[PDB]
Design a protein around this ligand. Structure first.
Ligand SMILES: CCCCCCCCCCCCC/C=C/[C@@H](O)[C@@H](N)CO
Lengths: 270, 40, 177, 283, 270, 67, 40
């Protein structure tokens, strides 16, 4: 009867449906949960909005062409302007959350291509200028549009639409895909929670992320706990006559969200 | 046997013996059995 | 320009509405706290944690009245520029009356469970500010400024770690008889 | 290839497995799920019974990060202090901003994980030499003082700061060695090897693990006054982790490092993957 | 030991202190409470932010002069731009809440004056043009600044600072104090939950309001459940030499707040 | 913020304290008495439960003057 | 365990565990309760 390909996820007033899934990854076999008293430090009663923030938010879609190199989003940064979650993020000095990420990309049984969907905890990026330069806030907190690696990649060496937000401007991150933007190799990214969207097999990837950090709760605007990466390993191959592109959509839903230290809105650069 | 007040002074802790790779090798939601079809 | 008793006196002006009374960042190892007993002992240690006790005592005439709003602003947003901004964080509305002292608490609001005592750090516990909630009304035949006295102490939850030398004492030559 | 059998408390490496013809196919799977099925040799070939005779103790994180590694090499001098306006630039004393990222060997081992919690065992070795004219070699005593953040920094080699009334410090002979333990001293529950966050000073924006790495400094000095000759003293600091706990394994470093704290690599760097002499079919 | 004059109210991260109170009114002897299942209609799981919205918010202070006629605030309108409460108000189509209102005004034992602090449920206002004209949204939803009745009052007939927001402009409410802006008499306002701030006795008034409505939950941007009114009955009399004015401050704290029907931000006139 | 609880011989740093509306006002006092009232955060804000996990051994006079 | 005749030779005494700030924080004659009015 039931299969691992057909799944339904319901969070708040939103529901995700999939008929071509490949099971679902729960990071380190840990489901998200609220902060227990035994691990708490901050004495303030936390705020748990529940269904008003723990729901699915769909980001802007991306276009996967043969020249694509990859995309990168940072959480909770990617959701900073998303409904009540974003608002709570700016009014509180502290917060913690888990997530359920859902990456979508459908095609036909004539298409070829493979996407690596990986979640990297504490993904500290390298600077484009190299040596002893630090990445400026703007580039390290790109928002819902994320970072397009195709602006200056490693694999075939291209410069798609940009080089960065405007162009190669002081403080941008090194966009070499093969080096994971941090001096390690792409092939080893599999040590982190991941799934593949192999067009011949599945059309979605689902990863549930618990709160991962060395502190019980943390500043949400100054720290990005995880980084979501979508990278084309096997290039996109469309059938004869078809458009050489395919859309990719990302939908994220915060889970077990807690907020603390409420004051006025946060002052961030840009 | 006992000549140090702080625990940081002691030597190595020794082997854990509780090494389970599951959380890294099989962090999937639905139970995947070896031998059964990966995806029904 | 020099150390004086006036350094401890917070001025309070009559008939002013929304204005600020005082303000300060919460670097307990520097600023206005450096020379207090708490600040002095805290400087012998590298890490701190816990809640602070901030008290305010009114010293104006018995026949005067006032309402003030004390605010504690956690880090992330700068110091409040107006009462509306301050009122959004942790605060206490104090009504001056028979009981002369208000004891506001600065609750431990932090992600990391310990903070550095070092003032040369990027961020502290946050900000502290006081505003006229109503205004100071002086009785007839009375004029001028009245004063507030502020106090600081640690709550029972306070923690101190890693002993270190303080930068509040020094010498160039050994002292003799 | 299951894990338990009675004789000698022996774990079996492989079970006796014969021919197969079934609908249960363990060697077929779907890697898109993100899982690695525990396929053993008995799943694809006929196997005999063998025992492990192995516990895997040397690969325990306690052992892996549990040996002394050089984390710093500094240099101090003993010479005439008269006329000098900067004792630190003259090397009469020197301070080390404590971190385990300066020397690459240990750095790469630590960076295999995201968070690590452990106690530290330090060993400091001091050696001397006299590059110039000397009639003899003098016995010297070195003082290593821990200056936590917030504590006054030494400005001169004979400052008042060297009284070390509250700062912990060690005194030992040059040629000899120093050793002490340090309990886990992080503000958080574990140290961060990486940090995807920044800080604000109203002046400059700092990004990375540098934001959290705010340990103190180690000030070194020769306690003795000057002799007729100049003495060069090299100080080597070694670190050994004890009672180790590690979290979130990572992709190992592939490219050379460029600076402390940053994950930057040099531009115009050599390829890290070996290129074949022949083609993809070569052996 | 304890007295009715000295009270402390703690909501969330805010605390109110008073040493010159006159007990406290709990509207119709009913403390606020969450909506029980038995009375529910909307099937959506409601969101209860708790401490992030159920806290004290202080509005802009008013100046009480001898020519003052009164002030009027509408809830939840008065808090529409207040922190996380305001945000939730705009993102949800439904919501319900109780309140604890705290009006402040201190003086000396030489001053005279009396303020009526009253809470009026469903305070439908009358139009300035009279006849068959309706009050325009802007004037009926004034925000945290409220409505100043001294712009065109009933008692001594003045025109303080304005006539309305700009001036007597089509759609303004009739500002006759003696007629409660609705054709009834001021003296009868005492049938509604109220307290007096009699300068010789007390300097604060406190009223706790439960959710009052004929529906279990309602639209917060299109409906104002209660109206808070502060009216000078006995005029302000200051001692010889003193400034003929006194500040009045209003602090309101939402209680047992629930939100439902989350979508994008609401579109309201102005 | 009281001092004793059963689990692990743990001392509580702060107790769970909700909204208040009382005639018992712990945050008002008189400093002219020369006393410092032991006011905790649970006396002025809503608090959750937390544990000390701390004995205060490094601030003992034995340690302070013991190096 | 025991190799010194004088008590001054032994190491540190260890924590007191009986730390009560009362004699410094509340050295008042009449009992002052938190919550009760400071002065009646
Ligand atoms: C007598 C002198 C006493 C000196 C005691 C202070 C030494 C402090 C030792 C802390 C060691 C650093 C721990 C941080 C480790 C991280 O750098 C790595 N996990 C990442 O590179």
């Amino acid at each position: 009867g039931y299969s691992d390909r057909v799944q339904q996820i319901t969070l708040g007033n939103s529901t995700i449906t999939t008929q071509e899934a490949a099971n679902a990854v729960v990071c380190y076999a840990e489901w998200p949960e609220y902060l227990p008293d035994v691990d708490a430090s901050d004495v303030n009663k936390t705020s748990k909005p529940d269904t008003s923030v723990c729901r699915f938010y769909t980001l802007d879609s991306k276009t996967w062409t043969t020249g694509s190199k990859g995309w990168c989003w940072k959480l909770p940064d990617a959701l900073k302007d998303m409904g009540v979650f974003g608002q709570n993020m700016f009014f509180h000095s502290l917060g913690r959350s888990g997530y359920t990420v859902h990456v979508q990309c459908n095609a036909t049984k004539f298409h070829s291509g493979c996407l690596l969907v990986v979640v990297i905890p504490e993904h500290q990026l390298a600077s484009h200028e190299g040596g002893n330069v630090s990445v400026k806030y703007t580039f390290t907190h790109p928002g819902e549009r994320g970072i397009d690696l195709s602006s200056a990649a490693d694999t075939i060496g291209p410069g798609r639409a940009f080089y960065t937000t405007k162009n190669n401007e002081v403080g941008g991150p090194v966009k070499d895909v093969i080096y994971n933007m941090n001096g390690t190799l792409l092939g080893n990214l599999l040590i982190f929670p991941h799934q593949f969207i192999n067009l011949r097999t599945n059309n979605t990837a689902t990863i549930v992320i618990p709160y991962i950090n060395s502190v019980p709760i943390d500043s949400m605007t100054r720290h990005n706990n995880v980084s979501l990466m979508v990278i084309p390993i096997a290039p996109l191959t469309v059938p004869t006559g078809a458009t050489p592109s395919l859309p990719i959509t990302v939908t994220i839903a915060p889970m077990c969200t807690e907020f603390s230290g409420i004051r006025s809105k946060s002052i961030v650069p840009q | 046997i006992n000549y140090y007040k702080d625990a940081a002074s002691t030597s190595s802790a020794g082997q854990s013996l509780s090494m389970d790779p599951s959380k890294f090798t099989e962090p999937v939601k639905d139970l995947m059995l070896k031998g059964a079809p990966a995806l029904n | 320009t020099k150390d004086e008793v006036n350094s401890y006196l917070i001025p309070l002006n009559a008939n002013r509405q929304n204005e600020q009374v005082f303000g300060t960042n919460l670097f307990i190892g520097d600023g206005v706290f450096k020379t207090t007993l708490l600040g002095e002992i805290v400087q012998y240690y590298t890490h701190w944690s816990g809640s602070l006790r901030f008290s305010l005592m009114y010293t104006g005439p018995a026949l005067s009245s006032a309402k003030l709003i004390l605010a504690y602003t956690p880090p992330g947003a700068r110091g409040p520029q107006d009462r509306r901004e301050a009122m959004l964080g942790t605060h206490v509305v104090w009504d001056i009356g028979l009981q002369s002292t208000i004891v506001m608490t600065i609750p431990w609001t932090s992600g990391v469970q310990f903070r550095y005592t070092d003032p040369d750090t990027y961020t502290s516990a946050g900000f502290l500010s006081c505003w006229y909630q109503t205004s100071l009304i002086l009785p007839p035949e009375t004029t001028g400024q009245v004063y507030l006295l502020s106090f600081i102490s640690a709550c029972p939850d306070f923690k101190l770690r890693l002993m270190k030398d303080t930068q509040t004492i020094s010498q160039t030559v050994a002292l003799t008889e | 290839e299951e894990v338990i059998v009675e004789k000698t408390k022996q774990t079996v490496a492989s079970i006796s497995s014969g021919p197969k013809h079934t609908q249960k196919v363990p060697i077929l799977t779907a890697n898109e799920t993100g899982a690695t099925m525990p396929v053993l040799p008995s799943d694809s070939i006929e196997t005999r019974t063998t025992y492990m005779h192995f516990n895997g103790s040397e690969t325990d994180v306690e052992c892996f990060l549990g040996r002394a590694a050089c984390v710093h090499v500094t240099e101090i001098q003993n010479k005439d202090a008269t006329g000098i306006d900067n004792h630190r630039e003259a090397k009469l004393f020197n301070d080390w901003k404590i971190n385990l990222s300066s020397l690459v060997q240990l750095r790469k081992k630590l960076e295999l994980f995201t968070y690590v919690r452990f106690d530290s065992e330090y060993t400091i070795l001091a050696t001397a030499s006299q590059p110039d004219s000397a009639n003899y070699s003098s016995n010297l005593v070195v003082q290593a003082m821990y200056v936590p953040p917030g504590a006054p920094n030494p400005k001169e080699w004979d400052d008042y700061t060297w009284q070390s009334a509250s700062n912990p410090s060690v005194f030992f002979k040059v040629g000899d060695t120093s050793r002490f333990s340090v309990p886990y001293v992080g503000l958080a529950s574990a140290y961060n090897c990486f940090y995807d966050g920044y800080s604000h000073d109203d002046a400059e924006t700092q990004y990375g693990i540098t934001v959290l790495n705010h340990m103190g400094s180690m000030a070194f000095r020769i306690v003795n006054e000057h002799d007729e000759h100049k003495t060069l003293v090299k100080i080597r600091v070694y670190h050994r982790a004890k009672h180790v706990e590690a979290w979130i394994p990572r992709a190992p470093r592939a490219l050379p490092y460029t600076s402390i704290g940053r994950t930057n690599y040099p531009k115009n760097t050599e390829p890290v993957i070996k290129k074949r002499k022949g083609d993809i079919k070569s052996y």
